[PDB]
């Protein structure tokens, strides 16, 4: 009778109970390679096994491994039986139809859930802040999307996707710290640098200015203690790292940056709703957590938009779990209860029921 909310991402699974304010469990979206090894227990070995990420750029790419992730979620993380709980899953924007059908089949045929639903991650994050209209920048470990939503409906023809997110930023920080004279190259060192990134990086308001400052001042320097006690220094790498979101050429990519994809997305929407989108830019996901990112986005979008445009970036402190929180609220709503796909409906209609109801 308590519903489950499982927000499955490229790097992390956020899972818990509908009605709770936060996910009970947050664990890595990895399998070690029947049987199986998952999460931090997929760190049974990085040896006889190596780590495998079944969700790539927000899309499930290995169904056997994802079954292991979901097994671990129910039995090991939440300690519930899937047969006893309706289960809300999340999906990426533009998740292929066959993908959501397969999610549905697995939930009903493998896990025997009494009911389930699949919700778009960006729509849930918008909803967490009490909105049904706005444009979401959702940026995680593996993928970033701009998703414009009008009165509860995502607008698929205007959705932008960049395969540039937190893991790429981590890898870039490893490279430029190594160029500074350190050496960060191994999988364990990647985790350390992810930690450095999450604690010390920020987005500069004026990048070329910030580069001049750092060049002729020590005032942007910060220190960080490695696990073995060595304390290292980090300087302009602090803001060069997340600058990559605005300038993807930093890691060799020739795509638009996140400010330009936000603008492109708005420009693909009907002219009549564009002002609503500009006034309701919402940020979601771990890679939107950088100090200075909301200000920098304001400034970049201001330079692109008409000079009369009113622009508001909304970046809640809880953004890291905005998707999950939105799912928790949604699954708790009285008017949502009619929307669950029941096991009976699955038996009557098969996996394509997911298109009719979700």
């Amino acid at each position: 009778t308590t519903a489950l909310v499982c927000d499955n991402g490229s790097g992390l699974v956020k899972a818990g109970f509908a009605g709770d304010d936060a996910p009970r469990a947050v664990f890595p979206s990895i399998v070690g390679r029947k049987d199986s090894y998952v999460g931090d227990e997929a760190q049974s070995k990085r040896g006889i096994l190596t780590l495998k990420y079944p969700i790539e750029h927000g899309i499930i790419t290995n169904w056997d491994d994802m079954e292991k992730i979901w097994h671990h979620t129910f039995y090991n993380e939440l300690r519930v039986a899937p047969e006893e709980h309706p289960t809300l899953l999340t999906e990426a924007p533009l998740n292929p139809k066959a993908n959501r059908e397969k999610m549905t089949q697995i939930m009903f045929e493998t896990f025997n859930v009494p009911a389930m639903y699949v919700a778009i991650q960006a729509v849930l994050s918008l909803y967490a802040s009490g909105r049904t209209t706005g444009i979401v920048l959702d940026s995680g470990d593996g993928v970033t999307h701009n998703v414009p939503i009008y009165e509860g409906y995502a607008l698929p023809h205007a959705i932008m996707r960049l395969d540039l997110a937190g893991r790429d930023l981590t890898d870039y920080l490893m490279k430029i710290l190594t160029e500074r004279g350190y050496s960060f190259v191994t999988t364990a060192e990647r985790e350390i640098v992810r930690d450095i990134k999450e604690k010390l990086c920020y987005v500069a308001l004026d990048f070329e200015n910030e580069m001049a400052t750092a060049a002729s001042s020590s005032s942007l320097e910060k220190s960080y203690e490695l696990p073995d006690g060595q304390v290292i220094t980090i300087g302009n790498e602090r803001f060069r790292c997340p600058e990559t979101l605005f300038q993807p050429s930093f890691i060799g990519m020739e795509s638009a940056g996140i400010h330009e994809t936000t603008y492109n997305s708005i420009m693909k929407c009907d002219i009549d709703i564009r002002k609503d989108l500009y006034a309701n830019n919402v940020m979601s996901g771990g890679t939107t957590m950088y100090p200075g990112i909301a200000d920098r986005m304001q400034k970049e979008i201001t330079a692109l938009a008409p000079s009369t445009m009113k622009i508001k970036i909304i970046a809640p402190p809880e953004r890291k779990y905005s998707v999950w929180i939105g799912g928790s609220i949604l699954a708790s709503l009285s008017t949502f209860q009619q929307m669950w796909i029941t096991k009976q409906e699955y038996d009557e209609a098969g996996p394509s029921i997911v298109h009719r109801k979700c």
Binding site: E56, P96, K97, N99, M160, R161, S249, A256, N264
Partner: protein, 413 residues
């Protein structure tokens, strides 16, 4: 004069002008006020209007839609495409040799003769090539002769087929003829002639039509769905498994294996199997018409990187060096290679500077992948591994402040 026009007026300038004058008077009866306005603006600003008509398709869809120049372009194009000829006609016009990738003077304007050396150079350069033509162009129905204006040493003598749109009109004292080029030119033969005491090259040219959707991605998608809904059901389960694996991101492993010559260096029977099935899938419904496709290339396909000084095409010398290395050359992709039916810029490759514009002959191996549900947003055509492309001509254009390159190419195997 006969009661019926010839297919070629040749040097009969007086009948050509009189006939086209009657034709201008007749078509005036079929142009609405907006079309007549379009024509008047063209007379006043032809060079810029023609320039816009050649490169308007390469920008973001919303940039194209917001450009006020679209009104003149669409209205003038409507005016032209509406007077279609009911049998072939031959036309005459001068080009810079650079247009056909001959980046030298054939002779100077003060020279009267053309060396056998230059004639042969030109011949070798414009031999065995389809050259893509775009935009508005004024042509003549008769061959320029004594006392006609002759701005270059290269005269094109072009046969246009039945149903070609042509707009006869009068510009003050002169009778003119407007077309919108939307085809490729083949130069069947060149000959040296003399007009008024100077040697000119006369190029005997004909056209090859291809479907080119340019920025009309909806039309291209309709066409693709129309021709490839079937295909997705025609695949063995092996083929369908193997192509979704490829599309679902397997392409990177499969293509690196091909590029690294893995089949020979380090055979992997599983991958070879995948390569084989994907190839057979692309032969299942061959490309059903001549078709133009577009690819935004990474610089690594042309031996450059983001930080190569030579990738700065805002410097003319880097464009010249690029042409010296690639123009007229044939390139080969050991990998399967993706292209689009659309020419519009997109977020994912917004900053890529090298655009391949590829003529695909009818019956080539290939598939419109965006008929297969799941990934429509690319309007993609997948080409077979080991494809060879002849680069006919390199053009350049400005996208904001950034100079980008358009590689007019043809699939030759």
């Amino acid at each position: 004069a006969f009661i019926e026009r010839p297919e070629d007026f040749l040097k009969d300038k007086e009948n050509a002008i009189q006939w086209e004058k009657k034709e201008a008077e007749r078509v005036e009866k079929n142009l609405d006020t907006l079309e007549k306005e379009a024509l008047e603006l063209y007379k006043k600003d032809s060079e810029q209007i023609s320039n816009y008509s050649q490169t308007r398709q390469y920008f973001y869809d919303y940039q194209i839609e917001s450009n006020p120049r679209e009104k003149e372009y669409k209205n003038l194009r409507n005016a032209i495409s509406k007077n279609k000829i009911d049998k072939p006609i031959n036309v005459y016009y001068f080009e810079s040799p650079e247009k056909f990738a001959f980046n030298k003077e054939i002779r100077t304007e003060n020279q009267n003769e053309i060396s056998l050396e230059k004639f042969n150079e030109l011949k070798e350069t414009i031999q065995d090539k389809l050259f893509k033509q775009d935009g508005f162009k004024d042509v003549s129905l008769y061959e320029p002769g004594n006392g006609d204006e002759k701005p270059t040493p290269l005269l094109i003598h072009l046969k246009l087929p039945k149903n070609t749109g042509m707009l006869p009109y009068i510009n003050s004292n002169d009778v003119k003829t407007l077309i919108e080029q939307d085809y490729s030119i083949k130069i069947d033969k060149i000959v040296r002639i003399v007009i008024e005491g100077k040697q000119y090259i006369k190029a005997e040219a004909s056209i090859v039509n291809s479907l080119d959707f340019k920025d009309d991605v909806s039309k291209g998608d309709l066409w693709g769905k129309e021709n490839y809904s079937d295909w997705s059901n025609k695949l063995t389960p092996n083929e369908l498994a193997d192509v979704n694996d490829y599309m679902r991101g397997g392409y990177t492993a499969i293509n690196n294996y091909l590029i690294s010559n893995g089949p020979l260096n380090n055979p992997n029977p599983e991958l070879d199997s995948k390569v084989n099935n994907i190839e057979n899938a692309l032969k299942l419904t061959p490309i059903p018409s001549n078709l133009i496709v577009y690819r935004r290339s990474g610089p690594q396909e042309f031996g450059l990187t983001l930080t190569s000084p030579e990738y700065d095409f805002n410097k003319i010398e880097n464009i010249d060096a690029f042409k010296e290395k690639w123009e007229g050359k044939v390139i080969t992709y050991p990998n399967f290679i993706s292209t689009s039916i659309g020419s519009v810029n997109m977020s994912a490759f917004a900053k890529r500077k090298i655009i391949l514009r590829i003529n695909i002959p009818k019956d080539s191996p290939g598939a419109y992948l965006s008929a297969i549900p799941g990934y429509a947003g690319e309007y993609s055509v997948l080409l077979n591994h080991g494809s060879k492309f002849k680069i006919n001509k390199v053009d350049s254009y400005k996208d904001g402040t950034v100079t980008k390159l358009i590689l007019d190419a043809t699939l030759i195997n």
